[PDB]
Design an enzyme around this catalytic site. Sequence first.
Site, short mmCIF file in Angstrom:
data_model
loop_
_atom_site.label_atom_id
_atom_site.label_comp_id
_atom_site.label_asym_id
_atom_site.label_seq_id
_atom_site.Cartn_x
_atom_site.Cartn_y
_atom_site.Cartn_z
CB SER B 130 -0.98 -0.02 1.14
OG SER B 130 -1.72 1.31 1.23
CB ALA B 131 1.09 4.43 2.01
CG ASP B 157 -2.97 -4.21 -4.04
OD1 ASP B 157 -2.74 -5.04 -4.90
OD2 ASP B 157 -4.04 -3.72 -3.52
CG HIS B 239 -5.39 -2.94 -0.26
ND1 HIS B 239 -4.61 -2.02 -1.46
CD2 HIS B 239 -5.05 -2.26 0.71
CE1 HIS B 239 -4.07 -1.46 -1.07
NE2 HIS B 239 -4.03 -1.17 0.26
#
Lengths: 246, 261
Positions: B130-131, B157, B239
């Site tokens: 993610s981030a 992701d 996710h």
Amino acid sequence: GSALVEMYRRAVATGRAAEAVEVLGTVATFRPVFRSPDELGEPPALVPLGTGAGGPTLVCCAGTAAASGPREFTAFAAALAGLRDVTVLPQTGFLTGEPLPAGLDVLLDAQADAVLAHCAGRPFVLVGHSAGANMAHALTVRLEARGADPAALVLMDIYTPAAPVPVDDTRLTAMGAYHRLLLDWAPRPTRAPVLHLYAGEPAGADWRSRFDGAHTSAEVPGTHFSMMTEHAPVTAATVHKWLDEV
Amino acid sequence: GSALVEMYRRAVATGRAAEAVEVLGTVATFRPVFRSPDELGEPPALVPLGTGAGGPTLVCCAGTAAASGPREFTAFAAALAGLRDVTVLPQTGFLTGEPLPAGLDVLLDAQADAVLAHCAGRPFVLVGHSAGANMAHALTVRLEARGADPAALVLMDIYTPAGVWREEMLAWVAVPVDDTRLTAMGAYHRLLLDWAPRPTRAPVLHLYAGEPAGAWPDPRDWRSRFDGAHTSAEVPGTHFSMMTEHAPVTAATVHKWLDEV
């Protein structure tokens, strides 16, 4: 303390207070509100500070700063002992547990309710200082809309919002929220006579409080702040003698 | 809870999480920062999660959400037990007592410092999710810009911080949070506002989730794409669950891809 507390401390010391208050107002839009007077549980509680003098009670509307509440009126009431009775009307939402008003008008109705009850049909006078002056004024016009005519309205160093101590997140968000409620404030007339008192000395580096349409508008010694502490005896006597006439 | 804590939870339950993140970034600007990697005091500490496998350790950068930190990689690391060493790089400022980076470059210099010191010239792989993948990517460019060469980079992701994917994603996260973590979340969100995929020497493995996280009414996609990817493979899960219940498949895909590049 809390990140909101640190932010407020640092923003006052760095000229960023207007920025801090706006952020507090958005945080406050996440707080439980009340949409009707009937949701509070108990009406706004009135806090007596000086009793035993007879005549109308001075209902002193708290301001909208964080360290607002009965302390604003401690010396004003002490000086008025024997002469006039002082009761404080706090602003709902500054104390833990309390919800914020969903809008100004729900608040004033709840306030109008609480006051009229507390006064059991007796004449009462409405009083406020700086932001509490706007609050006492908005509450006086909403009272008048109901036909309950307040005996008189004492406005102390009032300014127009659009044109101007340990604390906690509730107080700080309450202030952010109450700022938002007052942005639109405008000095609508009142049937109740207005005593306007304005400070005599500026508070830092014309700056005077002005109110057009006042019955009497008198200067009093001191600053925006000290008129209510150090020079409260003089401010007190001014109101006391001026009430003896209207 | 504090007013920020109640803000953030009322915000996710009411689809206002994006507004709350913004508020929090603004509050974060009032917090002490470090302006240079020497103001920091102690450099970012690296938390080992699986040791003994030899070869280049997988340096996993934490993400930037509420529950970011070493827990993101618990299952990943358990599944690589005895295959790859996994060590987490937390993001400075989420834990009480830590200040916030004055800017992203300050943070990346400080991180590059700490990673190179930890690794001691031994090759390493950067990993993120993610981030945390953006962070892992940005750290790759900074280390490469300094001559350091990460042996590979894995983006799980990755999305570009360009809007309802975030509101959906921040929903399904809803675990203790506090002002420091929340304000860090606001600050790092602001930090990655202008993140963009600058090129990397290191090879890039791109894993993307098989199942969507929430409803996207546009079926014309929601997928995580990355241009530059040496290899781009789809893994099972969403996710979030690609890193938890489906972590072993994620792990095995990573482990296999590292032998071939």
